[PDB]
């Protein structure tokens, strides 16, 4: 599994994450712009599955702030039955 890393030092708000996601994964900007479209992307067989996503540099405060992203990737991991791995480091 290749590991795709999101460093939250480069992300100042949840909306920046959607830009980082589409840039990282080589997707059109309009592919992801909110939680529902993020879910659809992760479920639509357009990512280079199987793969791991890792979040780094997430202080407690920011893990809380971005908790909807975390729960979404936890649920994606469950739904995808092992094809997607998700971890928050530290």
The CATH number of the domain holding residue 80 is: 3.30.370.10
Structural domain span for residue 44: 1-90
Instruction: Answer whether 39's CB lies under 8 Å from 86's CB.
Output: no
**If you search the block for the tokens 């080589």, which residue do you land on?**
26
Name all contacts of 12-20 with Cβ < 8 Å and 24+ positions apart: 14/65, 14/66, 14/68, 14/69, 17/66, 17/69
**If you search the block for the tokens 């879910």, which residue do you land on?**
39
Resolution in A, one decimal?
1.4
Q: Verify cis geometry, omega within 30 degrees of 0, for the bond prior to 50.
A: yes
Q: What is the C-alpha to C-alpha distance for residues 35 and 23, in angstroms, rounded to an integer?
A: 16
Instruction: Answer whether 5's CB lies under 8 Å from 58's CB.
Output: no
């Amino acid at each position: 599994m290749n590991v795709y890393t999101f460093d939250f030092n480069d992300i100042k708000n949840q909306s920046d994450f959607y830009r980082e996601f589409t840039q990282t994964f080589g997707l059109a900007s309009e592919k992801v712009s909110d939680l529902d479209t993020l879910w659809d992307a992760v479920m639509s067989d357009i990512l280079p599955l199987p793969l791991e996503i890792e979040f780094v540099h997430l202080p407690d405060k920011l893990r809380r702030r971005y908790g909807a992203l975390i729960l979404l990737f936890d649920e994606a991991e469950e739904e995808l039955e092992g094809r997607l791995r998700f971890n928050v480091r530290h």
